[PDB]
Design a protein around this ligand. Sequence first.
Ligand SMILES: CN[C@H]1[C@@H](O)[C@@H](C)O[C@H](OP(=O)(O)OP(=O)(O)OC[C@H]2O[C@@H](n3cc(C)c(=O)[nH]c3=O)C[C@@H]2O)[C@@H]1O
Ligand SMILES: CN[C@H]1[C@@H](O)[C@@H](C)O[C@H](OP(=O)(O)OP(=O)(O)OC[C@H]2O[C@@H](n3cc(C)c(=O)[nH]c3=O)C[C@@H]2O)[C@@H]1O
Ligand SMILES: Nc1ncnc2c1ncn2[C@@H]1O[C@H](CSCC[C@H](N)C(=O)O)[C@@H](O)[C@H]1O
Ligand SMILES: Nc1ncnc2c1ncn2[C@@H]1O[C@H](CSCC[C@H](N)C(=O)O)[C@@H](O)[C@H]1O
Lengths: 239, 240
Amino acid sequence: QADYSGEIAELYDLVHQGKGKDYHREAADLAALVRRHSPAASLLDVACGTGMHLRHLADSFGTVEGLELSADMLAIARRRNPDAVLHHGDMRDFSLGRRFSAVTCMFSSIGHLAGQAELDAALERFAAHVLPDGVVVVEPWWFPENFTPGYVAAGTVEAGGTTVTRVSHSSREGEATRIEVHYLVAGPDRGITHHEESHRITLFTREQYERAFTAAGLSVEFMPGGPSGRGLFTGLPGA
Amino acid sequence: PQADYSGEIAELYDLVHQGKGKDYHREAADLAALVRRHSPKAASLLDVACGTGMHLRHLADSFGTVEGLELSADMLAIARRRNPDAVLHHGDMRDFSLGRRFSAVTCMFSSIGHLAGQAELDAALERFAAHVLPDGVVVVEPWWFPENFTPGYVAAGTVEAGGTTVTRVSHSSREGEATRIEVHYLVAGPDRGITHHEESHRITLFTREQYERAFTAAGLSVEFMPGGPSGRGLFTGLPG
Ligand SMILES: CN[C@H]1[C@@H](O)[C@@H](C)O[C@H](OP(=O)(O)OP(=O)(O)OC[C@H]2O[C@@H](n3cc(C)c(=O)[nH]c3=O)C[C@@H]2O)[C@@H]1O
Ligand SMILES: CN[C@H]1[C@@H](O)[C@@H](C)O[C@H](OP(=O)(O)OP(=O)(O)OC[C@H]2O[C@@H](n3cc(C)c(=O)[nH]c3=O)C[C@@H]2O)[C@@H]1O
Ligand SMILES: Nc1ncnc2c1ncn2[C@@H]1O[C@H](CSCC[C@H](N)C(=O)O)[C@@H](O)[C@H]1O
Ligand SMILES: Nc1ncnc2c1ncn2[C@@H]1O[C@H](CSCC[C@H](N)C(=O)O)[C@@H](O)[C@H]1O
């Protein structure tokens, strides 16, 4: 698959716990990042997936909302966040008719975009949903200079009797990484099952991301490291 | 899945089991010490279902003469490679006939489990008795007893050596008198990408008294020794 669904979706949360991903820390850092620019009322997490960031962010802002494309990923988010408004929708083409102090897009979700025209589009959509003293925060994929082809990642986690193993292989394919992922899933009653997904995650350059912020009328800054080592862009309207 | 220890499962077996922390060197050292406590002048050994032949390599350095038996070609093939100066045979613990007799006959790592019932169990213990010296000793590592089997057991292990990464997950259930053990592998590498393999076996859950009967039926006075190389204890037989 390539669509974050079924057992992949149900697995995602556990998988990334196993990986040490710390949405509390990330949410806290992000909340702080936003208050630096909008000293605040409201946040929209776009491609909020399973709603992990949202869960921690809800204590930090008057209002938090989500936008997700996958229906199965979104169900999980709604169960984790029953009191929050979560939208089915496409970061490239969406209107909600309100603005927010922060509009965030985390964990390289932007790389699911296919080229400059799709990137520009979502940035125009983000700029449109951000209050003018507000901020747009996007964590990119890796740039091409930093892509390491042939990369193999192997990790195992157990929880609730249930063990999940995930192996990823990354190779080059045009201006994209083709990351191929297999899972083995095992539990005392359910047995073992095999899974696999393959994704194309576009390898936009620093300067293409920045293009898109500028065309959306946002000023743009890159800050290295970030939650994933890929860094973190911000954009402030009125440029 | 395959139940035959062939192709890919064979190539991996050795890496996988180093990965598991299996110390064939200490296992041999404990063997040789056991064999000799019983048979102080032993000097010869047959390892039945010797597999990739890991025990045998270390057993060379304790006994002047070692040989092996193994049903799987692809496993046998790797054992011969590891043991150039040894005579290793192709065939079946149930029905086999070399020309000779050895101070010790061994069958390790629950290979014995791979027999389907008492008939076969007794068949194999008869053959072992046929190939041991009077002053010698037969040693079989059993599979788990029924009193100790754990339906629903999961084992997951990953290991990396020289750019090959291998992950193994197993699940086990009860299936009649047997363990049903279903095992999956993901193998991966920078150029090779990821491939997926699997196997399923039936491993017979023999009761202690069934092992004992088989030894006894074959003229061997039996004793069970707790613990052993894998938790499963160790059965020793001496002619008389
Ligand atoms: C929603 N985003 C996820 C999702 O799309 C998933 C399918 O792939 C990636 O997940 P991981 O971040 O878990 O990746 P994993 O840990 O399995 O592999 C790390 C990836 O990062 C690359 N990488 C990693 C490092 C450390 C580097 O310096 N350069 C670099 O290009 C190699 C591999 O594609 C995305 O981030
Ligand atoms: C040549 N023998 C091998 C081979 O036939 C293979 C297919 O399965 C077993 O491999 P492992 O022993 O590595 O097994 P693993 O780590 O996958 O799991 C341990 C097995 O032992 C059972 N078990 C394990 C424990 C610890 C116990 O207390 N009781 C019990 O029944 C559950 C599982 O089938 C055989 O030993
Ligand atoms: N065009 C698009 N619009 C909105 N969401 C998208 C999208 N393309 C992919 N996605 C979503 O991006 C997500 C990648 S997983 C990222 C999850 C979440 N942001 C976290 O940090 O844990 C998936 O939910 C996928 O369905
Ligand atoms: N009927 C039989 N006769 C001889 N070998 C057998 C057999 N049935 C299974 N085997 C072998 O039993 C082995 C169990 S795997 C264990 C290998 C080796 N003894 C070790 O200690 O690591 C496999 O090589 C399999 O081919």
